[PDB]
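Hello Y.,

Per our agreement to keep a running log of every chain we model this quarter, I'm adding this entry. I've kept the format consistent with earlier entries: sequence first, then predicted structure.
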Amino acid sequence: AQPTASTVEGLFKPSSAFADRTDFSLSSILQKSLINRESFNQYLAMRLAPVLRTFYEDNYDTDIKERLNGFTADTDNAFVSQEQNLRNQFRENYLVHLQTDIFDNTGGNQAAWKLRDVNNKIIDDFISRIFAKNFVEYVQDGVGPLTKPTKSLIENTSNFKNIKLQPKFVNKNAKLKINNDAVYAAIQDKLLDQFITNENPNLVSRVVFTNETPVDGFDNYFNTKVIQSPTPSYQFQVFNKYNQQSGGTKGANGFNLLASNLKSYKNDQSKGIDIPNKFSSDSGGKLLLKASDMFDTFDPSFSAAFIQGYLALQKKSKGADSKEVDSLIKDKSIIENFFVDNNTTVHKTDLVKIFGDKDVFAGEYKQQISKAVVDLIEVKKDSSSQPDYILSRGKDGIHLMAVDGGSHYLTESGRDVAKQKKFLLFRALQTKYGLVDTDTTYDFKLFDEVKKYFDTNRILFLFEALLDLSSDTNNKDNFLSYPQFKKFADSIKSIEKDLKELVQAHYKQAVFNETAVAENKVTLKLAERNQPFIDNERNNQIEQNGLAAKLPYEQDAKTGHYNDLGNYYKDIIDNVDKKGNFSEEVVSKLKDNKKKVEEAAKKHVEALKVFTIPSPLYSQVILVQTKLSFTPESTSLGLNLALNNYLTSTELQNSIKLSYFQEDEAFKKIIDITNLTFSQQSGGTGGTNGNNNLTADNWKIFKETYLLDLFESQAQKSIFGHVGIEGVLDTLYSSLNLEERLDSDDVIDYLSYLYTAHWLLKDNLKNYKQSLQSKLSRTSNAFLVWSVDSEKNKDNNSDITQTEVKNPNFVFGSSVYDRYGFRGIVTSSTSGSLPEAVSRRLFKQFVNQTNNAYKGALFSFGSMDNLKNIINGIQTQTEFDALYNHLTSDLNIDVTGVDKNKTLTEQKTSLTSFVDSNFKQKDVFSRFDGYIGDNKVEEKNYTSYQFLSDGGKYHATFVKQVNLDDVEKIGTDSLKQEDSSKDKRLNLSLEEFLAAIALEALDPNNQTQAINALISGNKKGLVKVGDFRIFSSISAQWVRRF
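Predicted structure for the entry above:
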């Protein structure tokens, strides 16, 4: 089957270089690919599974020996099937697509496919067999581990040292068929420790008393006249009071059976805390609150309360009240514990002051709630002791939680990961032999949890575990010293000097990435939980809150981060740092490790001596190769796979777009693209001369406008802190880690906006003039509007349009507890951002029926003869219809003698005659620069301005008039700092003009035009690509084939 010539001519032609820039060379593209997490893991698979091939090779078991032969046979059969189906599908040109859509993604060779699928099969099998057995044991000396250790033997802190995750019949000095378990128990105890290290997986024994529908009746608690038809939930939380007659063990009865003897559920020998299942409404028991999905799989009020207990052990918990076990309110309902004293810290929801002079509660709630209200309190055995039990109410009722072993492996110095691993191994041993108490059930499988967390990094984590295994030369009891695994442990030894410098950094940064991702969920989900209690206050439904209480956790005004809740993850990044506020520490140690990955990847690619192999027949990729590696073929294919992932990735596309910015010398004079810092600092480097004459602060406002446009699109706007907005904006900017991520969408969009802002600023605003001309019109007034919403209407003459509206629409939380308004040049056709009230007052009700009220109405024409030159310019009937309606229904100018029945000539003739005979010079053509509301006044006379009124709300609006008589007048002298040149920029100041230009730059049409200018205005032309994976990845608007 000779392939047809059409596809052969039409297929991509591989070249010597991937692209034609100084950052797209082999030594740079391979380094960047090895820094890409997904690409790096695709490489590590091919550099890690050759290590695990040796274990299958020297293994005693006949089955494991035959696994390699079976994998090769299955690979041959799969190749036969692939060839058969490709032939039956493509016929004439099947070989071309066999090399194109299969081999290129695989390594570019027939044997490349077999070295991919076999090398993945063996690593998958080795991954499965690590966790195929349970090895948590209490090891006795001279008889081996006891088949069933006794309860009193293992439930001791001093006896934790004997729970070491060791196999049963493994002898170092013997060739045992099942000696391979000595491998897994060594790797598992490594992987498990990673699980103990990164996830910080504390166990919590918790009891939840679900929300109770009150048989007493909600009217007793929450009156219907204010709260109609309550439903059992957090906001209306009620439990039937404790009665001794009914023989119940849940609700207040369960809380009485529980809190009376609360001190007796901590097994002080084991330091663990075990609370009975029957005392909880659900199945009850213990849950694993690891760092990753504890704010995902469970309620935020639950996970955050567990964190509060976590730091309560470590004397780091803040904001919560403390009361002893004996002080618990068990006779009354449970909620009475939370009505804490108000007289004079602890963050208490004083609902008496919150609801003001409105009756929201009734009966016992009204009498109690005076007395503040909280959500979480700390209950402890003794006044001198530290809080071991935490009581908090969430979505599904009130939970009493206690971390078990917290006094053991969590102290003021931080988390003790060795003790934590020992304690969780003790719990896993408890579950292994059914040695738990009869009144509790262990829904706790540590091996399943470590397997599920480790399976995310199925390649990096296993490789790092092996490296740390071979990094411990002082421990002779590992499987490395077993003579059965002498060469296998040598294979792990042949990968330290080569890759470990890179893999340690990659692991230490990926774990930090996951830790930052998980700790972002803290401030994300706490805000999500607090969202309805802000919605209620927004909708004037504050009374719906009822029993809603603010959590004790403090937030950062300057950062928008929960510091104490971040300590739970700081106790992770302080552990992965030693391997080999949390916000500041992680932001420092992510860049200090990203530079380490840069260095390690560059050294690894250097030491590999990478050269480009010529591509095979019908190939469309630029493959690479190496020879300075322990297994040259697998390392070459690993680099091939890492490239196949990076070239198709959006990181390389954003790198190409980054290079297009690199080329533009005009833009690079004002920015430092790699540094993402505005250039020229502050001085005379190019200052002052034409061609975008402005400072570097003059670009900070463009950046701030971009940040505000991004902030307005945020799903939640309180995850970034609060007061004003100049701080929240830089916090949002930091949150993007743009300088740490130069090959992201978040940076190409930022730079696209920045060159949109410059492409309106260059050539003496040659494109800003065009945008304004195509936006403005002569028959419609245009304004620069500073419109603020005043919920209250009016020397006590402070301007309200220049006073910052902190927390507008309650966007930075709630106020009661814990020159602005600019819209740019807004016209009638584009008045979406303006409120309908002010937009109608400007572009449809300029001169209201209630003098200077006509000033600026026909300023859209600017001069006397201008509207005369436009009225006779009408050719058709509808063209005059629009003008007449605008002059009457919009510009409210009285018309005399006009007739609809007139012909085309007389139609315009009557209007021209009446315009001339009515305006034979009321400052109608003057420029209106002042306040518009219920009345109209100038800027100077703010003492006589009536705010616009609409639907009970008020508006304060400043408008500066803009016509085409100043759109054309912006030119070379438009960016000068001088005040006398303000007429050269729409009679604006420089800052106002640049803010308007930035708002114009946010236009998608402006950005598209400026980006096409960037690509077309390239000194070297469009970037060429020699690899198809770089051509298909990014559109032809940026890259061209050779």
